[PDB]
């Protein structure tokens, strides 16, 4: 599909949010775990231990 060049825009004061970055470790076999359920499943939490 066609990605067009955009029309030049005038700058104005921004109110765009800037979220924190985050690093996330997943299980080694996550693909197998998601497969055998056949549904969207919870795998971890943002803060969880190894």
């Amino acid at each position: 599909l066609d990605f067009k060049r955009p029309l030049v825009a005038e700058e104005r004061l921004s109110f765009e949010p800037r979220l924190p970055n985050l690093q996330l470790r997943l299980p080694h076999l996550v693909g197998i775990i998601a497969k055998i359920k056949g549904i969207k499943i919870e795998v971890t939490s943002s803060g969880e231990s190894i």
Binding site: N21, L22, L24, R25, H28, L29, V30, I50
Partner: protein
């Protein structure tokens, strides 16, 4: 006769040794494949951080 009797005795010894080895080979494979699966389960998985620059390909 004696060649036949001897051939029958030698044949049975080699046939016996053939099977005792197969028993061993299959018993080892099942052990090792199952253990490697257990080890695979407990390895550290990947890390994601949404950084595009890190995944550049030139």
């Amino acid at each position: 006769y004696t060649c036949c009797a001897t051939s029958s005795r030698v044949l049975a010894w080699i046939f016996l040794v053939c099977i005792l080895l197969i028993i061993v080979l299959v018993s080892c494979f099942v052990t090792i494949s199952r253990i490697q699966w257990n080890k695979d389960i407990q390895v550290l998985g990947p890390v994601i951080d949404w950084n595009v620059t890190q995944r550049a390909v030139y």
